[PDB]
C-alpha cells in the first residue's frame, strides 16, 4: 500500500515536493500521475529517471528507501491538480496499486479559514425514527479539510459521510459532513461535536439535545 | 494521435451486470498491455486489472476487491477492450478509465524486476450503482439556534434537486451545498441561509425543493 499526504500548498514560482511512501517502494520504482477534474490523468515520471516527451523539465522524480518523491521547481498555475503515485503492491507482485493522491494547490488567493455550522436533528426527523447531524463547512481556501466527529470527547467513526470539497461562486471551496445516528443515540449523550481542521488549525462546533 | 474512448456507462442495480467498451486507435493495439482504472467520484484512483497481449498468453490480473466479479477481455480485431462487471456492488461506482500500459522487461528477470505504467488514458465512463430508480426527497427544517437556518433534503434519486428560498426572492446569504451519495445509494444535501439574529423572526423563510425526475415540489417553512 502506498501512502501520500492528502494536501499540499505551494506559492507561485516556488518549489514543492510530493512524497509517496510504501513497503514495495524499497524494491520497485514509482510512476507519477497528474489528474485534473474532468480530465484524463497524465503520466509525469516513471522508473529511475524517465520523463515522457512534452512533460516540462521542472517535474522530476526521485527515490530513496521506502519513499518516492515528485518535485516541481518553479510552480505554475497549470500545476494545480491531484498527484498520484503508482507501483507494485508487493515486491515481484503481478498487481499494481495507486496511492491516495495529493491535492496540490498553487496559491491564487489569501488563505481563508473555514466557516462551520453544526445543525442538530430536526424534531420532525426524530418523529420519523431517524437522526442526522449536519455540519456545514464553507468559505475556506485551499480546498482541503479533515472532519472528525466526537460524541462528548469520545471519537465517532460510524455513520459519518463527507463530501469532497468543491469550489463555490466566491472562488473558495465548501464541504458538508453528515453523521447519521439512531434516535436513541442522539438522546443519550451530552454533546456531539463536529471538528474541522484546516491548515493546522481546528474549529469545533457542538450541539446538544 | 493515440486515442482511447470508453463507453457503456450507465445505471445498474446491485447484483446487475454491465460491459464497458474501450476503443483504441493510433498504436499497435495487438501487443499493448491494457489496464482498467476506476475512480469513485471525489476520491482517488484504484487499479482494477490489466490484460496482456497474445505473446504473454493473454495473462490477466485483478485487484483483490474485484476478483471473481469482473472479467477483462479484448477484441484485437476490433481494437476494443472490455470490462465485464458482474454481481455489481455499490462500491463499484463510478468513473472507469482504460489505459495503455507500458512495462519493464528483461530476459533474465522477466517482469518481476520492473513496474507498469499507463502512458495514455481515456476520458472515462461513469457507472452508477444503486437499487433506487426514481425517489422524491424528504425535507426537514434546520432551525436557528449571526444566525443560520436552512433545510435538509434527504434520500432522493437521481440528481439534480434545486433549492430556492422564498420562491427565489431570497438570494443573499443563501448557500446550497453539493449533494452526497450515501452507502444506501441515495443522495442528501442541505441549503442554509445566514441572517443577523435580530431579523430572525421579522421575516419568514421557506425553502423550495424541486426534484424534477420524481416530479416533486416541497415547500417547508423554517421557524425558530
Residue numbers in the entry:
A (entry chain L): 3 to 9, 11 to 95, 95A, 95B, 95C, 96 to 209
B (entry chain H): 1 to 52, 52A, 52B, 52C, 53 to 82, 82A, 82B, 82C, ...
Per the authors:
Antibody 10E8 is one of the broadest monoclonal antibodies thus far identified that effectively neutralizes diverse strains of HIV-1. It targets the membrane-proximal external region (MPER) of the HIV-1 viral spike with a highly hydrophobic antigen-binding region. Here we show cis-trans conformational isomerization of the Tyr-Pro-Pro (YPP) motif in the heavy chain 3rd complementarity-determining region (CDR H3) of antibody 10E8 to be the mechanistic basis of its multipeak behavior. Overall, our results show how a conformationally dynamic cis-proline and the interaction between the CDR H3 and the CDR L1 of 10E8 appear to provide exactly the requisite degree of structural plasticity needed for a highly hydrophobic surface to recognize an MPER epitope.
